[PDB]
Ligand SMILES: N[C@@H](CSS)C(=O)O
């Protein structure tokens with residue numbers, strides 16, 4: 291009920307366990323708390339494990355089963371597919387660098403080019419929110435010189451989703467994997 295500024299990543303995690311103690315989710319409250327945590331690189335260095343060729347997903351907390359909290363690491367020019375979020379809430383907070391978020395509408399069943407609804411540049415410490423009822427999105431680090439690090443919370447947890455072909459709107463099921471869990475590389 292009473293939202294306080296998270297002092298550290300650990301404190302944020304404790305607050306998040308409180309916010310997800312029940313069966314529902316106050317989206318605006320979760321977003322405010324995520325936004326209020328000041329990114330401190332020393333606190334999340336353990337999870338910030340990059341790969342040269344694509345972005346990595348690094349599990350931080352399993353939220354007592356109610357959410358997955360993870361850190362995504364985007365090399366220069368690394369980006370995602372256009373994807374949905376499997377009927378889950380999805381929060382994205384920038385911890386380092388910038389990411390471009392492009393929004394798309396759910397495709398009609400006819401094969402057509404997916405045209406962008408809009409785009410925005412998410413900046414350090416800002417927290418965005420998406421869910422399937424809002425639409426689909428692609429997230430990209432368009433920087434040539436700066437890696438980006440983001441903190442993502444999904445509730446309920448999911449490890450599969452759909453990728454959408456921008457040319458047709460065709461979807462394919464994708465299994466998402468973790469690069470690391472609790473700071474441990476999981477090959
Ligand atoms: N949801 C994507 C990243 S963009 S929110 C993922 O979890 O891989």
Ligand SMILES: [Fe+2]
Pocket residue numbers: 373374375380427429
């Ligand atoms: Fe996403």
